[PDB]
Symmetry: C3
């Protein structure tokens, strides 16, 4: 496409929503290629990641950890206006794994506090992809401070299984998983810092142990539980997009399965089926499609159970509906 | 199927055998759907896991680590009678990744010492699946204390390759891999405790380092070596089921390959082929099919070689038969 | 084939080249099966792996870490003459994951300093496979001292995508990833030794932490960056072979993708497509095919960014050519 052809394409401004929710979209593309516009303001902010009150100086796209999920269709152009407010103290940029060229856009979006930039790229490949900040010389520090999210490039014909059958979800959730490396004092208590830079040296030492102190979903231990638990109903089809920009994860839906899982997150790669626990390598996004068949509470975890239950990588689903005794039944309840 | 139809299905009791061996079964289903009955008694007991007398208070399904492999066919029902003797001290339950609903059966099988329960679930998805204990609030502790195993849900038509050609094995082995986190005193000596609970705090601390003190097959260093090596003969087809309920592993048959490997453990997902080293994520089981071509000793390991040779994740196969010089030959033996 | 028949096959002597380059070869087999000859001298030597002058007592095949890539075609025979100089201090051998029998050849190639051996095996399976030293009792120590490499067994008809379309690369690079475990003194300073054996005890202690002190490409931090960056031009098809003999890795081409990725490293297993970040388990090799579309610098990393940017797992590609504004463009460059 020439500049003239691209300038002639229709444009659509999209309002982002906070994870785990996803902004309104159409699974099957409506019309021809478009330039989909998004705007995100970067916020360096203090966030609490656990019930004890542990703090992290987060570097957050759109003010959240993970950054929001942007949705477009194959061959659409994603045009992101990225803003680094003067209240911030560090330079930031953005690397879209979905993009081609200049370190994913990273080489063209380096903005200092008080600057903004507009990057446009063609979403040539379908799938879910990670996006993350990556300032030369300070790459992992920004990523493990929460500066990452994901986008979904849907095929123009919507999702299909490995054999051509269409797969239409009723709802979609985006679960961003984050590994945090929080310094501790001699009492084993987590430390607090006045400014983000003050935490750098202590944090890098923890990062080098390759052992996170917290592994969480949606930015905090228990963030997707209670009134914030995800929801579904028996018979409902749910797509769960999951990303980890720096470290491996192994998603599992307790009491369920991944009926179709694009473990690599790429739609042209046939999905695995009937999965118990799938694997998403650090630096990637994956997606699982499931039709709930049983009501009740489900846990959704990173299946290194220590990471799930001790470090924080566990969410819940509340599912409404009728119990199916054919699928499962207590023949004899716990008794003497 | 209707209520009467399920109640009318034949019921069959099966005697279990301890890993790495597998109970009597047919690869191709015999007759229509059946309710296959198994019984397992939970045993809390101290076991020695290395050559230094290191102890672990194991929580063992059927008295073994891993728990035994249960085999059924797709759409059969698995009806487990689970017993928790009054001599035990903790509440236990069971979560079948192969099942649908109630946290895999966990929400319906919580039994205190002195209680038993009977759970039935329809094995709707074909493949090998992990099962493990999962008491709310203490999930990883029970799992990393050895309370996990696996089941195999064979397709009613038996196994097939990607082209639909039948794959029939001569023998099957089940290798359960267990990551242990044993506390040490300040002098580096592994600690011993009177009761399981006494070790809880110390153990969780080691678990949080995400660094196991031991990684073993069949419950101990060297359990599947020497006089306990698994066996085969040239020309024999062997299925090796491998599980890891809490942590990633990467199986490798030294001197062989995985001709067909259902790396995700699910039979409707086409098997990878000609594999050197496959990957099984924590929280899942995988299965490899190999036809032996050379006699001699083989090592079967988790290919992070430190885990295999320093931590304990190494087994052996002793294979009989004639050597094939076409496949391999020493043209010039070691000489000065 | 009989001994006589093999004896009558044509023989071709190959001259090996140091990584990341690969020796001359033809993608499509030239003629019928042949006995491809390779010779490698083992060199125990000191290598400096970081800018702090940190030393490792390398055990290097052909004098490099990783050892060089050997290329043959399916059903050719690979005949390796392995030499252990009298100047070396340890026994060494070689295990080809591509081979069948005698522990991959390890049991037939144990050579003391001053000895040599000749091993021949039939390359029956197509793909990239790891090869590494494995002396009984000291297996991981030699592997994490850099004694590993890989070989590529090309289909006789060259590479093809999942549907049969031929995939022909213009260039090929071999990236060997190495996890190193360097002991430190009380002040956190890396220790130096005057003999491989002297560091054994101290190194095993670090190895047991399963936490490498360094993770590098081609033997050292920066080995494949700056001036030693790999090169290509817009429009060129490049195959990147990557191996890790002991620990998992997750390759990512920053600003690009893996158009076709044989993540398991095996050619009869259809490749995944449109990959952002792929996964290679320790003990295996993988291969990605990509056609460059944008010029500029590309980072190629292990996407656990701490491993890439703190521990050393990062390489560069320098690509020439014209920028494509359709694929990506800076609508508004960084500005106030
Ligand atoms: O899904 N927790 O075992
Ligand atoms: O399978 N040992 O490298
Ligand atoms: O691919 N570097 O984030
Ligand atoms: Cu940033
Ligand atoms: Cu990246
Ligand atoms: Cu239990
Ligand atoms: Cu589970
Ligand atoms: Cu060696
Ligand atoms: Cu090996």
């Amino acid at each position: 496409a020439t500049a003239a052809e691209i300038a002639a394409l229709p444009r659509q401004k999209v309002e982002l929503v906070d994870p785990p929710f996803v902004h309104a979209h159409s699974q099957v593309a409506e019309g021809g290629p478009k330039v989909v516009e998004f705007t995100m303001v970067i916020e360096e902010k203090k966030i609490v990641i656990d019930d004890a009150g542990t703090e992290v100086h987060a570097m957050a796209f759109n003010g959240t950890v993970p950054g929001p999920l942007m949705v477009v269709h194959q061959d659409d152009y994603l045009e992101l206006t990225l803003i680094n407010p003067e209240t911030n103290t560090l330079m930031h940029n953005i690397d879209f794994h979905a993009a081609t060229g200049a370190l994913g856009g990273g080489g063209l979006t380096e903005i200092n506090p008080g600057e903004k930039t507009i990057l446009r790229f063609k979403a040539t490949k379908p799938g879910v992809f990670v996006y993350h900040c990556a300032p030369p010389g300070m790459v992992p520090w920004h990523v493990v401070s929460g500066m990452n999210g994901a986008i979904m490039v849907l095929p123009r014909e919507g999702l299909h299984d490995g054999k051509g059958k269409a797969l239409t979800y009723d709802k979609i959730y985006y679960v961003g998983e984050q590994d945090f490396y929080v310094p501790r004092d001699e009492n084993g208590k987590y430390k607090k810092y006045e400014a983000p830079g003050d935490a750098y040296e202590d944090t890098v030492k923890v990062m080098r142990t390759l052992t996170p102190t917290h592994v969480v979903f949606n930015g905090a231990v228990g963030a997707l539980t209670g009134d914030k638990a995800m929801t579904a109903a028996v018979g409902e089809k749910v797509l769960i997009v999951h990303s980890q920009a720096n470290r491996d994860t192994r998603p599992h839906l307790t009491g369920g399965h991944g009926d179709y899982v694009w473990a690599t997150g790429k739609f042209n790669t046939p999905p695995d089926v009937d999965q118990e626990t799938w694997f998403i390598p650090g630096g990637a996004a994956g997606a699982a499609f499931y039709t709930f068949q049983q009501p009740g509470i489900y846990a959704y975890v990173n299946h290194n159970l220590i990471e799930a239950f001790e470090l924080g990588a566990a969410a819940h689903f509340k599912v409404t509906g009728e119990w199916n005794d054919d699928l499962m039944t207590s023949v004899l309840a716990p008794s003497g």
